[PDB]
Copies of this chain bind each other. A is one copy, B any other.
Amino acid sequence: SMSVAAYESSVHSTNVLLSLNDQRKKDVLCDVTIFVEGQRFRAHRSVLAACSSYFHSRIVGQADGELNITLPEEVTVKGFEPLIQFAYTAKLILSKENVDEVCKCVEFLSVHNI
């Protein structure tokens, strides 16, 4: 009976991000490897660029093929793992044990929205 309907979903963005997290965890449809202290992390260059000024600058311009990025020794796995989890889930867990390294890694990567 209506001429126009404009709908919004409050959960769709959350569902997409959690789908992307599942892909990351399964290493399915990923397109960049991040090396942190030599350890391998798979991700999507689109998401990394969306969440970090540092990654954005190392990703825009690069070949469309497989991309490998090595982070320097300032970034530790202890500081990076909580932040890649935040990027893909919107949840950040800090402990007294990891807070100094996560802080360091946030500064280094300039993660948006802390």
Contacts and interface: CB of A to CB of B under 8 A. Distances in A.
A73 interface: no
A47 interface: yes
A65 to B, nearest CB: 6
A19 B50 CA distance: 6
Nearest to A28: B60
A54 to B, nearest CB: 15
Contacts of A50: 15-16, 19-20, 23
Total copies of the chain: 2
A89 B48 CA distance: 19
Nearest to A113: B12
A10 B13 CA distance: 10
A57 interface: no
13 contacts: A4-B95, A7-B91, A13-B16, A13-B90, A16-B47, A16-B50, A16-B87, A19-B50, A20-B50, A23-B46, A28-B60, A31-B31, A31-B64
